[PDB]
Structure formats: C-alpha cells, structure tokens
Design a protein around this ligand. Structure first.
Ligand SMILES: CN[C@@H]1[C@H](O[C@H]2[C@H](O[C@H]3[C@H](O)[C@@H](O)[C@H](NC(=N)N)[C@@H](O)[C@@H]3NC(=N)N)O[C@@H](C)[C@]2(O)C=O)O[C@@H](CO)[C@H](O)[C@H]1O
Ligand SMILES: CN[C@@H]1[C@H](O[C@H]2[C@H](O[C@H]3[C@H](O)[C@@H](O)[C@H](NC(=N)N)[C@@H](O)[C@@H]3NC(=N)N)O[C@@H](C)[C@]2(O)C=O)O[C@@H](CO)[C@H](O)[C@H]1O
Lengths: 137, 136
C-alpha cells in the first residue's frame, strides 16, 4: 500500500550500499568518487548537461559542476555539445558491468526466467509511467 | 540477458530517483533543506542510528554525514544517540503523502496479484543483497 513505497526505498538503499562496496576498488583505481561513478553511469544511458544531471539528481548545481569537469580533465566524459563518454569512461562502465553481472548472477541462478519476464514487463510499464510523469513536473 | 535486467533495474532506479527529486524539490525548499538532508531524515523516519553506521549505509565518505547531522540538528528536525524530532516527522508525512498518491495513481490499474509477485521478487532479491553485503 505505502508498504511498497517503503520497501522500494529500502531496496534502493540496499542496492546502493552493495554497489558502493562492490565498486570501492575500481573507483579508487580510477581517482573517481562514488558520486562521480554515478554520473558516469547516468551517462551510460544518455548524454546530458550539468543542468539535466542536476535535475535528475536533485543536488546543488555547483557540486555537479565540480565533478563534471573533474571528469573531463580525466578524459572519462567528453564535449560532443553535451556530455558524452570516452573509452576510458566506457571501459570503466564495462568493468562496472562485469562486477555487477557477476554477483547478480550468483544470486539469481535459481530464478525462473518466465517469472522474471512478467515481473519485468510490469516494471517496464511502471518505468514508462515514471519517465512520462517526470517529463511535465 | 542478465546484463539486460541489470541495465533496466539500474535505469528503473535512476528514474525513481529522478522522480522523487522533482516531486520533492518544492517541499525540501519549503522546509529549507537539501536533498541529502532529506535522505538523512528518511532512514531516521524508520529508526534512529548514530554515526558509524550513518556512513556505512550511505557509502558517502567521512563526516559529511555528521556535517548534515548537525546541519539538521540546527533546524531542529533532528534530536539527541541522534533520533528524529516532531519537526521532521511532519516533513516525512508530507513526503509520504506526495510519494504514495503518485505511486498509487501509477499502480491503481494493476491486479494486486501482479504487484505482489513483483514485491515478492524484489523482496527475495533484497534478501540475497543484504546477506551478501553482510559477507562484508
Ligand atoms: C565548481 N567547483 C567548486 C569548487 O570545487 C573545486 C575543486 O576542488 C577539489 C580539488 O581539486 C580536489 O583535489 C579535492 N579533493 C578530492 N579528493 N577531490 C576536492 O575535495 C576539491 N573540491 C572542491 N574544492 N570543491 O576543483 C576546483 C577546480 C573546483 O571545482 C573550484 O570550483 O569548490 C567546491 C566547494 O564546495 C564547490 O562546491 C565546487 O562547486
Ligand atoms: C531512504 N532515503 C532514501 C533517499 O531519500 C532522500 C534523497 O536524498 C538523497 C538525494 O536526493 C540524492 O541526490 C543524493 N544522491 C547521491 N548520488 N549523492 C543522496 O546522497 C541523498 N541522500 C543521502 N546521500 N543520504 O533525496 C530526498 C528526495 C529523499 O528521497 C528524501 O525525500 O534517496 C531516495 C532516492 O529515491 C531513496 O529511495 C530513499 O529511500
């Protein structure tokens, strides 16, 4: 009811907590900060502007600005303008996908692919409505 | 296949995060706090947990979580041990009110059976996650 909304929040928290730890090294190895790995992952799906990243993230623009250019200086992202990605940034995303796909597998080895399929389409539909509602305000 | 589910879930969460941000901006402004100060009140919406664990859960390094702690202690949305005051409780109700009616509106045409199965799958996935985490 609003149980679900709490579960979801708690679930997202848990997923972030696991991602932070699982990625502690690759981030370090790269100079990268957590909040920067995130931006690097946000750009993994679409190009942005400091403004778009700041809307989609809700944190004061300056902060997004501090990291946006720390990332350019490191040749992880690139201007075209907009915020794209370089291999070093892709390869990081590929190294991030490798770890991620590895434990995710470990704990879903016993799942039923069909039970997952219907679950997926329920969510894909909710994802659709989330994006769509966000478009306005 | 699993790389796919991972991308979607990541995207699904990036969108939920996005939405909660647009939906709660005016209110966080109306209460004079940032998004990260809002976050800090929502776990304390459940419980009360002092430092040490306060960064552990987050993943956001050294004393920033304490930086926000006194930041919020000052607006008196937080108390002392560090619990949550009557002040923050009001905020949360308002947060929950906005969140729930939207989620309700986006879910109201689904068969309770479908939603529960979703819940049950995320619930078993959250179970493995926690346990795996605990393997520190
Ligand atoms: C726009 N940048 C603001 C500025 O960050 C600084 C930022 O400085 C960073 C150091 O290089 C880094 O080694 C230093 N150490 C790291 N481990 N990253 C950062 O903590 C430091 N951050 C910062 N000064 N804000 O690099 C400078 C180029 C800067 O962007 C000046 O604008 O000062 C920050 C103070 O909060 C502002 O929030 C930022 O928005
Ligand atoms: C349990 N609290 C979680 C947290 O809630 C907080 C959340 O706070 C988060 C900021 O938005 C985010 O930009 C910021 N994101 C980063 N990538 N750094 C978070 O750091 C911040 N909270 C914090 N780090 N403790 O933003 C506020 C809108 C909030 O939803 C309360 O209303 O973030 C939410 C994101 O959807 C989670 O779902 C919630 O469960």
């Amino acid at each position: 009811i609003e149980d679900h909304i709490s579960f979801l929040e708690k679930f997202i928290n848990d997923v972030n907590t696991l991602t932070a730890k699982l990625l502690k090294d690759l981030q370090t190895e790269y100079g990268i900060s957590a909040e920067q790995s995130h931006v690097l992952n946000m750009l993994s799906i679409e190009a942005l502007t400091v403004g778009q990243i700041t809307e989609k993230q809700g944190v004061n623009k300056a902060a997004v600005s501090r990291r946006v250019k720390k990332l350019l200086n490191a040749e992880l992202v690139k201007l075209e303008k907009i915020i794209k990605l370089s291999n070093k940034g892709k390869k990081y995303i590929k190294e991030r996908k490798a770890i991620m796909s590895h434990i995710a597998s470990d704990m879903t080895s016993d799942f039923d692919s069909k039970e997952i399929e219907k679950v997926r389409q329920v969510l894909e539909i909710i994802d659709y409505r989330i994006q769509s509602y966000t478009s306005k305000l």
